[PDB]
């Protein structure tokens, strides 16, 4: 049994982390007070859920998490929320004034004076691990803290924990739920200084989560609560293998091996289905072939793109529910004869498949409905580069006029780090095209 330490940075990272650990508890049977009736080893044990929860002599199950925000308003929701008893105060770190959506401010100005503190709190969670696997980092692209402070924390974690792996859950900026104009800058700044420090990154485009809420859940104007309860469902499915008995994705190392053959291309696309409204009278339950066939629809991708005009490098299918291998293979055959799935000639055309028999848990009173089976597909497609193209294009439009650039230089950053960062994306985009197009 090896431990996994989760790190939530910024508002988006913190709220999403609040919805995952809420979901983790309902899944593993943990109550708000940290008590777990099904755990027969009191204050000890090396079970599959112990990779995410430590135990106290009193029987409390404490998440292996650390929350970090440069302003206390968002983390204060955790200290008084439903699951306040789960964490102790050390795990929650808050500042006094934020980064004002300025990467330079979160990385340099404010980050420098708080970096040593975070590491020390993280070192305390590491001092409980008998064999720490790595870290799961949740943050946003647009926020000054989520972008600026994350890249700095990543640089430092590669120094204090060299051999340890580091995965990202990043939030792609979408104008429909953002009031910041400089989020392109931040996104492209953080992705540059973070690239060589992350082993595998799952981008969730708010635009995708937004339309999935409006279309499937019939929410006219979704709130962050709606978005986070869905995002944590995907996260739960991706982390399940680490928290349950199983043989696929049993530790963070298996994610890079099974999903990232080329290092810089460590952004797998995620697809999820089904997402059914809870307010529905009563839905006809989908089969294995129907939910699998849905994983190849742009409508339920975490990043809107067209995989048909890309080339897959790897592919995983995580099933949760009443599913058996006989049904999985059946659907795959039928899909290959219909769909357009072009692999790269230096990778096998295969699918690693995991199955967990416990169906997806739903938050009481949430928006999602209880389904008997559901799947999450992690596919490394060159089609995700479309996201980088859009983002890069917006960057070019502003930087051409140096718009807003003074706010970054005013916090000590050099104007050169802009182009240097943008040239790295230009290289990232070329690596995708060299691997996909003919």
């Amino acid at each position: 049994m090896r431990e996994c330490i989760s790190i939530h940075v910024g508002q988006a990272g913190v709220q999403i982390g609040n919805a995952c650990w809420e979901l983790y508890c309902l899944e593993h049977g943990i109550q708000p007070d940290g008590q777990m009736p099904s755990d027969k080893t009191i204050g000890g044990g090396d079970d599959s859920f112990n990779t995410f929860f430590s135990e106290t002599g009193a029987g409390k199950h404490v998440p292996r998490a650390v929350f970090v925000d440069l302003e206390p308003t968002v983390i204060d929701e955790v200290r008084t929320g439903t699951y306040r008893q789960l964490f102790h105060p050390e795990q929650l770190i808050t500042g006094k004034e934020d980064a004002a959506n300025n990467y330079a401010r979160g990385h340099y100005t404010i980050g420098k004076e708080i970096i040593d503190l975070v590491l020390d709190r993280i070192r305390k969670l590491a001092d409980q691990c008998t064999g720490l696997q790595g870290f799961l980092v949740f943050h946003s692209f647009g926020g000054g803290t989520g972008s600026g402070f994350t890249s700095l924390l990543m640089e430092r974690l590669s120094v204090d924990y060299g051999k340890k792996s580091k995965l990202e859950f990043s939030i792609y900026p979408a104008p429909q739920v953002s009031t910041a104009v400089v989020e392109p800058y931040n996104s492209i700044l953080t992705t540059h200084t973070t690239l060589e420090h992350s082993d595998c990154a799952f981008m969730v485009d708010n635009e995708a989560i937004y339309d999935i809420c409006r279309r499937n859940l019939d929410i006219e104007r979704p709130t962050y609560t709606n978005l986070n309860r869905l995002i944590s469902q995907i996260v739960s499915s991706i982390t399940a293998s680490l928290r349950f008995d199983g043989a696929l994705n049993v530790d963070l190392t298996e994610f890079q091996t099974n999903l990232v053959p080329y290092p810089r291309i460590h952004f797998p696309l995620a697809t999820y289905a089904p997402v059914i409204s809870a307010e529905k009278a009563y839905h006809e339950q989908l089969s294995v072939a129907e939910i699998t066939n849905a994983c190849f629809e742009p409508a339920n991708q975490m990043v809107k793109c067209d995989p048909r005009h890309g080339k897959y490098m790897a592919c995983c299918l995580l099933y949760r529910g009443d599913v058996v291998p006989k049904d999985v293979n059946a659907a795959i055959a039928t899909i290959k004869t219909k769909r357009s799935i072009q692999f790269v000639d230096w990778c096998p055309t295969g699918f690693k498949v995991g199955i967990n028999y416990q169906p997806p848990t739903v938050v009481p009173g949430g928006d999602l409905a209880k389904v008997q089976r559901a799947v999450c597909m992690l596919s490394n497609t060159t089609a995700i580069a479309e996201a980088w193209a859009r983002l890069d294009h917006k960057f070019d439009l502003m930087y051409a006029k140096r718009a807003f650039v003074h706010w970054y230089v005013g916090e000590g950053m050099e104007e050169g780090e802009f182009s240097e960062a943008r040239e790295d994306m230009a290289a990232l985009e070329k690596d995708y095209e060299e691997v996909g197009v003919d």
Partner: protein, 54 residues
Amino acid sequence: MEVIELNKCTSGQSFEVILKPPSDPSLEEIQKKLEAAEERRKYQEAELLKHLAE
């Protein structure tokens, strides 16, 4: 259409299917980046105060 490495436990099972075969900055350097920008903030604020003194 082959199914290899079938692993089964009580909570589930995982396997593989093959359709077709194929064909850092040290601690010293980060403290310098941080202290370098902090020096350009100090020089920009000094020039601001110098302007205000004039």
